[PDB]
Amino acid sequence: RKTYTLTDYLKNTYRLKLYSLRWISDHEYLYKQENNILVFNAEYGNSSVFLENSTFDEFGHSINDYSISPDGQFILLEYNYVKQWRHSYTASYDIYDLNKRQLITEERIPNNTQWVTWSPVGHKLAYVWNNDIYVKIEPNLPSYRITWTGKEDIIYNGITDWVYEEEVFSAYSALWWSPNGTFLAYAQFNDTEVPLIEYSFYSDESLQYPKTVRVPYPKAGAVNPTVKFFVVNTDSLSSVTNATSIQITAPASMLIGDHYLCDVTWATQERISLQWLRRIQNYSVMDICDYDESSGRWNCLVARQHIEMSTTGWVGRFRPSEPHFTLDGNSFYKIISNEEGYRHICYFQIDKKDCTFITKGTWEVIGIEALTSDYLYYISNEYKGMPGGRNLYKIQLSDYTKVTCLSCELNPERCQYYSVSFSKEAKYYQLRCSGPGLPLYTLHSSVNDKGLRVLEDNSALDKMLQNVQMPSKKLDFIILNETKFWYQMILPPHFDKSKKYPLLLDVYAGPCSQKADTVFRLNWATYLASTENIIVASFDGRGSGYQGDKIMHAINRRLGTFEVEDQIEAARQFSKMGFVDNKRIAIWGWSYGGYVTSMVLGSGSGVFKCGIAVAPVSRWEYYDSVYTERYMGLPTPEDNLDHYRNSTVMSRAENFKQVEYLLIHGTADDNVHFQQSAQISKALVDVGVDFQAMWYTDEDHGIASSTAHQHIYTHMSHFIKQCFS
Amino acid sequence: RKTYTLTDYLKNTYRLKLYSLRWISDHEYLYKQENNILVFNAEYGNSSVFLENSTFDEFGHSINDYSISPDGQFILLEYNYVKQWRHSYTASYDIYDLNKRQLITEERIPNNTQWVTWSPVGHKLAYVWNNDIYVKIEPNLPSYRITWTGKEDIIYNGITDWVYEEEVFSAYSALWWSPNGTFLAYAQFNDTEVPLIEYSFYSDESLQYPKTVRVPYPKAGAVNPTVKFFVVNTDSLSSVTNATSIQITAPASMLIGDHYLCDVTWATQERISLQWLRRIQNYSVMDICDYDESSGRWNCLVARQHIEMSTTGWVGRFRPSEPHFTLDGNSFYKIISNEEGYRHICYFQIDKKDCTFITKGTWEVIGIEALTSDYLYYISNEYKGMPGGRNLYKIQLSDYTKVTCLSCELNPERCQYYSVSFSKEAKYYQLRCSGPGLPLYTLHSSVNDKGLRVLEDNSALDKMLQNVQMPSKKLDFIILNETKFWYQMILPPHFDKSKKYPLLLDVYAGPCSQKADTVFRLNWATYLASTENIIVASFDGRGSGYQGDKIMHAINRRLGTFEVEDQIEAARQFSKMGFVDNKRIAIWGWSYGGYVTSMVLGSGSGVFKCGIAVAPVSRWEYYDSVYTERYMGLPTPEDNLDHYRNSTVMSRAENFKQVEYLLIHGTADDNVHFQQSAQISKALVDVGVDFQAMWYTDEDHGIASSTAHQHIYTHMSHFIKQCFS
Amino acid sequence: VECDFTKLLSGTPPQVYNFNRLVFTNCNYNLTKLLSLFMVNEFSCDGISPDAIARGCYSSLTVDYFAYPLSMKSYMQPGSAGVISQYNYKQSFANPTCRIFATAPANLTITKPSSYSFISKCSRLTGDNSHIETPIVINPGEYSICKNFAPNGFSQDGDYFTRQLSQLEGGGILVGVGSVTPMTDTLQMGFIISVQYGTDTNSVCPM
Ligand SMILES: *[C@@H]1O[C@H](CO)[C@@H](O[C@@H]2O[C@H](CO)[C@@H](O)[C@H](O)[C@H]2NC(C)=O)[C@H](O)[C@H]1NC(C)=O
Ligand SMILES: *[C@@H]1O[C@H](CO)[C@@H](O[C@@H]2O[C@H](CO)[C@@H](O)[C@H](O)[C@H]2NC(C)=O)[C@H](O)[C@H]1NC(C)=O
Ligand SMILES: *[C@@H]1O[C@H](CO)[C@@H](O[C@@H]2O[C@H](CO)[C@@H](O)[C@H](O)[C@H]2NC(C)=O)[C@H](O)[C@H]1NC(C)=O
Ligand SMILES: *[C@@H]1O[C@H](CO)[C@@H](O)[C@H](O)[C@H]1NC(C)=O
Ligand SMILES: *[C@@H]1O[C@H](CO)[C@@H](O)[C@H](O)[C@H]1NC(C)=O
Ligand SMILES: *[C@@H]1O[C@H](CO)[C@@H](O)[C@H](O)[C@H]1NC(C)=O
């Protein structure tokens, strides 16, 4: 047969089909077939054409994306999409009336719009243009300006800046709609004193002078942005008078120093749940926060604040979790750490400090997916004791002892990694599968837990891949002095433990990182294992999440010590197996994985022979404040400065004389700047180490442009084959 | 025996001794032994002491350089030396009396001063501090200010900006002293509208946010700095009145467009000879200006303008040459191109348009070293018809047919490349040789061309080199369709004509460049030939400058066409010889060997296996105006836009698939920016060509830092060794 | 009817090249008023020169006032070939006229200019490569062709202006260069007065 090749990987010869649907009601979802937007009745499976492929009626602009009004009488049409950052972008929009037949040309949305969203109930639009919020009650009618203080790279009204988008909110939208769409709550940011990063973006070939990109970027220990929270009443808007935004001030526990806003959530139609966090990310306070009809203000009591703390580490996995409120709003459910360290579900009341654990065990709850009046649906890694898997469970809110798994036994030898999408009111749900087998989408009924139909079983790929020689996958554990840590190995086809194979140790080793999961992937490791007969292994040591806060918080204030040593010990225990060739061992990464690769390769261990560090981290004083000050503290002499200086790659530059090192970095990188590789190179030069470098001009952290994405992996493949001969 | 190892090169194990002297008078010069400034008597050589080794003047500040006063009563000591560009720096100066033995502690020269110079006779200092010019009539006396209109990066009074310093003047000093020192003549440059180039300087491991370096740099076709020329009378300086300067305007034949100022030279003590260049460097006007006592101004007459046109190309080898005036100041000798196209000395009268050529032949004079009342000394490549050899001749001013060679028969087998240093009044001269043998310095009496003594024989290095295997060197010619083109080969030790040898072909191929001459060198080619047994050949094709104006002006407006094909044809001719291995042939060069190497590899010839381009030029619109506009004209659709766009490395990227490429560039490069290599790498990624790259952090064009200079050659010598198996 | 003399000291005086030529017709004049108003530094009227021109009758009277530094009085004296008499202004000795110099204190209502200016180089570039430079001398009493680049005054010394003359002017580029003397502490005025006899139109007469 044939094998997975670089041509098959970089051209996507073998593709995974995905059934991306979009619920709009209790029983209907919208699926986009050839170009038509369909509507499927979920109980029987019959379909009807919601909008025929008239998208070429415009014909002047290709439609990047669409958004149906929740009631179903309008639709937005993106075009001229331009990407700024991972989540940020700009586009131009058109509104198409699904009722008459006609595209609206009256008071159109501006061209350089930054964000646009629909009200959850109705057909009201709020959009951001030039860092300012405008609200359209009717698509025909003009828009009312809300905020007048927007400025470029200074004040962000309704959208997040670089640091919040990248780390805190993980999104570009900083405006939230009330459940009825009555209130519009948004957050304003202020980057006046935040220092700017500057790098050269050259151009396409025809620009004489390279341009400079200046982004407000706070580095570890530098000035952070400032946030403000406002809530608007959209029903009382008028053209004659400017809108009135009522500020909700942070609780007294946060105002003493520097703090973050980390969550917003609407409990009732009039009760917000703001969640604040401090720059010293040990302490968070939630504000169950109400509205007065008579006063019109949001007075926000102190008896309803809920404090979460962490003595050992930091609050949350990457952030404090989100409350899943009960319908009446007098209770909510949330995932917090127990006394044993594992994260489980607390029943809270808004007026009581204590929570009751409805779940407990030596596992964690990854998320609460749906909450009904009688049952709570959550994703857990309880089944089989494997942190890799993620199955779906439900609990009776009346009797917490009754737990039923809705997806453990559906397809046990093929699906072990589930994701669920729930219809409104949680009547039907689509169980997405990606586990140890080709993905499988199925539609289920919440009334009786019965499988209605198989949406996409990926049967054509199961026929194409019986002609290819495909790698295996192993998932097991190794005991480190009391504890079991999980590793994965992508074994070559026709694997034989009698013979020795090379080993490339794929590394991320980031804090709260799952790397030995159960997902099925088709990537560069499939190439290596199938064609080059390399073993590509990954390991989860100290600092990895989903196994408790004892493992996760083990690297607290000591980034770059236990991550590195666990990877080196994992490589040693791999090499002391019967099928790993001791001489040929390598390691690589793209991120904190690149940091770990550099700090493992320049540690003098002698285990490894070779290594690639794509977009690595060198110092933690070069990276942003939110990410580094969560795991390492401030870089001041009194708190933590010995370890901001004593764990750097350039302090190990004399140990690179024993390894072959490839250092790759894109020259226009916002996230992990080019500085962090440009100084690794300088430190390596100053000591006399020969290393191979490569720069990808105008590329960013995730080098993903098709030409650059093929170049990076062909270059890395050549380097690996040279290292392994 | 040993060989010449990379350690022997990067560590300067074998070091050539120099004999650098300063003629302070007509018969005495100041050598410098261990640290002692010794004054020698030329006729006898008995060496009395001038300043003892006890240099604790500032007690800790290392003295970077010294400058004895012309009268000998003071010494200028410089320290705190900070380099800016190839010819620019800022330092701190303290004066030290030799009449007394006391360091001057009153009215000192400020700490960060750009250029300091003495008067030609007497003790006056003129220094440029913060782009402004000051004069000290007495070293222990407060300064006088001349210019009040100096701003950083905009207006330069008495110093040159980047572009004039790099090309027009090749010096940081734009202030000139009269033969007395009565007047001081300076130039003002205005960079208000010249666009800036911005690149990043990381500058340390400690610097959290990388710095941005902004330099005023006119790229080809952009706005260009202006020039104003002033002369100030130093003998009339007072504190009560700010100094007055007399401006001299360019001739009106230069005022119709854009122009340069390419030369300034003093004829008499009241007569300055300015020499301008039109922006299209086909035209040039030389202007003799006479100080008018009654008017107080400087009258530049029309009948004394001497215009030099070059119909077939640019004027001058790199810029129009300087006059060599006589004592009376009513005539001068200048090197201009004759009718046959060979640059010879022609004798001008001040007030007559015609001049009379005094030398003729199929060769070129390189410079007029000294002009005595009865003789004129010049350096020519006439001897034996070798363009790569320089010798010294004298020609009698009374009879032009009497020419003697003063340095032809001194040591023919060992010296064929000469440079002379003439004493004041031209009564003694030192012959500095660097010919086929080791460098050899001698002192001669001008009275009857006697040979006094051998100052430096380099006899220790000879004995050191008698025990290593040193390469040969062959300097011959090949004929191309009618003409004679000269090449050189660094032949390995024990060179055998029967055996096949790999060929590396060092390139500059710059316009008016000699790459096959007789100079003795110890460099990377010596390593290659000695240890690796690699022939390192260099070829003089069309565009070389000491063979006539028909060879040199052939690449006029045609850069990248003949320079590139001549090297490929030279490689084919070398392959026809028996000793060259045709499979292993490589090419390389530094930025214009870089341009030519990139263009040769991206041409589909198939001759060359691999190439190294160091700091290469990519596109001629990315480069400065003075250099590029000299050889190519303006990048406008009327003049030469077509060949500006047809001579790019980027448009040759599809032919790079048959080549192995190493692309090296320093990220802080100011001359040939990192934009060049960034745009090459982008163009080879966008089409799918695999290549190797390396960046050097904080490094300028001439990578010279000891660690980086050691790293680049160790990297390149590994790439070459991999190419040649 | 009177020959209005207020206009000479009205406003800011012009430069030497851009003089305001002046004419009187059928009026009455008193030169003694001008002499009393302006302290005279030098008085070198040539030709008829009756120690003044305030008693003779004429067809018309001409004034060519300009602001000039006293330092350069020699260039405008007769028989000179300096830059002033070549490109800026030459006195018209063909007809009855003479020369007057004065200076102005703060007591006067006159406003000082920015600085004194004069033309240094006014040339005609012809030939391929624009190589022949043929100076344009000016006939007496005529404006220089290089006046129109900066009529009010020259900004800084060393200004390189240019213009392409039409086939009527003679062809070729016209390069004009101006020189700026730094402004003196005290203002100065220079007058060149031309008197013309009328054979049958002798109207202008003294009071
Ligand atoms: C340096 O050059 C600049 C521009 O060539 C000069 O600035 C100009 O000054 C004039 C004088 O009024 C203005 O009208 C222009 O608008 C200015 N141009 C600009 C600012 O771009 C400047 O005066 C020169 N400096 C000198 C001669 O010392
Ligand atoms: C010479 O001229 C310069 C012109 O710059 C004078 O320096 C300026 O003097 C004024 C006061 O009238 C200050 O406001 C400026 O700041 C000065 N310029 C600078 C660059 O400092 C200088 O004073 C004059 N010299 C004499 C002796 O009058
Ligand atoms: C060189 O220096 C001498 C004096 O050392 C100058 O002699 C005087 O120069 C001035 C002009 O600046 C004349 O007006 C004097 O008549 C000269 N003789 C004296 C003062 O005795 C000589 O001119 C200088 N050379 C120049 C300025 O070219
Ligand atoms: C957006 O730009 C296009 C031109 O590409 C223009 O036709 C259109 O009117 C613009 N729309 C708005 C809302 O300004
Ligand atoms: C933003 O910050 C600046 C300085 O920190 C402050 O002056 C301003 O009031 C803040 N708020 C704004 C601009 O709305
Ligand atoms: C710093 O040095 C080593 C490694 O660099 C580290 O293990 C040690 O604990 C640190 N010590 C101090 C005093 O910071």
Ligand SMILES: *[C@@H]1O[C@H](CO)[C@@H](O)[C@H](O)[C@H]1NC(C)=O
């Ligand atoms: C060399 O000797 C001569 C006399 O022979 C003497 O005048 C001269 O000063 C000496 N030179 C030095 C530098 O002492």
Ligand SMILES: *[C@@H]1O[C@H](CO)[C@@H](O)[C@H](O)[C@H]1NC(C)=O
């Ligand atoms: C300067 O003094 C003598 C010169 O003969 C000798 O010791 C040496 O060259 C110098 N001394 C030092 C300490 O450099």
Ligand SMILES: *[C@@H]1O[C@H](CO)[C@@H](O)[C@H](O)[C@H]1NC(C)=O
């Ligand atoms: C230069 O700086 C040093 C240290 O700041 C100071 O002592 C000295 O006086 C300065 N010299 C001058 C000329 O400014």
Ligand SMILES: *[C@@H]1O[C@H](CO)[C@@H](O)[C@H](O)[C@H]1NC(C)=O
């Ligand atoms: C120089 O170049 C210009 C423009 O390319 C051309 O007009 C001229 O004839 C050339 N030769 C001379 C001598 O100016």
